[PDB]
Amino acid sequence: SLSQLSSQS
Amino acid sequence: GNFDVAYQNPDKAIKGGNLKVAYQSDSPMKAQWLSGLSNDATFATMSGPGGGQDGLFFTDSGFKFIKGGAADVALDKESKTATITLRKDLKWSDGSEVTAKDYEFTYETIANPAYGSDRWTDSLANIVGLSDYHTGKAKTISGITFPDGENGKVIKVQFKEMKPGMTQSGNGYFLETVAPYQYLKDVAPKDLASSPKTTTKPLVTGPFKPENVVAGESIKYVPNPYYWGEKPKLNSITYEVVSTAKSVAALSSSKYDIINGMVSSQYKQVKNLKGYKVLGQQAMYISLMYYNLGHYDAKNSINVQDRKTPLQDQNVRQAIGYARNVAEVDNKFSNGLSTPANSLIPPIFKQFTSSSVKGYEKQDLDKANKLLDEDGWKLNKSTGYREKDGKELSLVYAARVGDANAETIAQNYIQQWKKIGVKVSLYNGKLMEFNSWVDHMTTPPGANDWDITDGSWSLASEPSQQDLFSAAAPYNFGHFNDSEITKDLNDIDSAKSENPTYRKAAFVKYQEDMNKKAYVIPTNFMLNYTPVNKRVVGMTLDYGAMNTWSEIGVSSAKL
């Protein structure tokens, strides 16, 4: 994969 | 805990299914089909049916590179190289051949600053003649070579030093995607990021192609006729958004077959819903608490730790970390799907996790109270907040938007910080919307007016964290710079870390230094879940399942 920003918490 | 990773439907599939997928997100689809120009998890997932942003390599269940995918990659220690071989029958969706230059173009779309990408890393400087190309001292990448020309199917990447993560995906020492050079070459490098040819009308390599793309909403996938692998069973997949408030209403309505990325708190509501099987896996994920400790100088690509704040003192960082009652929140709201984190490495990389590492998973008001008293922050018994040497201890908390509990959780943490004598207040007296949060943190140089914030991630498939926290990293949103943490990050990828006993230790030290230095406070590890409708066949979350989009199908109408 690759590093990706999430909306989660 | 333990779910099913695959829904094992014995009912065989029809010829022409119309699958209806969705991803939970309260912000418009930020559609970008070039891996190197994108930094968003919602669209990483939504690009799946179209070859997951044009990734080349198949892998096993532990993300180790295997043969069989769009390309193979042959590492060699003596040469210090990676020989990448494109399939002969690997073409783009318009029918054009995928060849050497397309792979190499991916390196240009990141390394060449004209395209305005955020994804360069010191890791890429490990490739020969690539750093000079990046700074503009050489007009080509000497390390990257084409044994049988630009139209040929072989690329040879010569490295300076080999690295231990090179056998695994997401390592960041070499790239794993292609860009359609022919289709894009005549668009101005600076224009590429926002061009329709890389947003609304792209070329793809995956099993399905985007026939239509409704910007900030949806994609209609139909089978890509020029796909190398198996013929898909489905006629068309629609991948949409799908907000948090309407997710359950959509599942009860049976509007979607699959909904990826649902918040942990909606699981108790979704479990009860029949007509769906709820799968789940260990999420490749981490949530954090950032401290603004400086800025990023882009001219010199470097983190500078220069922001003036009490959070520059190690004790204050720890104290604020020890205050939080995460365990409480996770039990009260997260249905056993989020576990407080003890460190930066999530359990999915089980080799490198260890319960010898204590972090901030246990509430310790009393230790925090001390830590602050011992750094000259004395409690003002009149007001109940700590004052040091004139100034009151107060910080701004850039909390983000989330579920129906989002608001209650943020105010809960203020109480906790109030309990240890710190006065926290929300950024602009309101919760922060995501896309605006992204801009505020991700855009250089860095905002000036926030002290604390939260920040989630879908991590790379290789445990090394050089892209997030290295000195040159633009994804270091705290903007700390510490020669010891630079040494830890580096020692994990050292020649000595080929021996996995050694690297096991290098990762531990990293995790213990990173918790002790407390520049970032880890919040939650997380177990994924996806509700799959009972009519769907061949669905699975199994990593190493390399043909899910080809083998998946339906059986009529949804339950």
From TrEMBL, chain B:
One of its GO terms (cellular component) is ATP-binding cassette (ABC) transporter complex. It is a lipid-anchor. Residues 73-461 form the Solute-binding protein family domain. InterPro entries: Peptide/Ni-bd, SBP_5, SBP_5_CS, SBP_5_dom. One of its GO terms (molecular function) is peptide transmembrane transporter activity. SUPFAM superfamilies: Periplasmic binding protein-like II. It is found in: Cell membrane. Coiled coil: none annotated. The keyword Transport applies. The keyword Signal applies. Keywords: Peptide transport, Protein transport, Signal, Transport. Gene3D superfamilies: Dipeptide-binding Protein, Domain 3, Periplasmic binding protein-like II. GO terms for biological process: peptide transport; protein transport. Belongs to the bacterial solute-binding protein 5 family. This is Oligopeptide-binding protein oppA. The lineage of its organism: Bacteria, Bacillati, Bacillota, Bacilli, Lactobacillales.
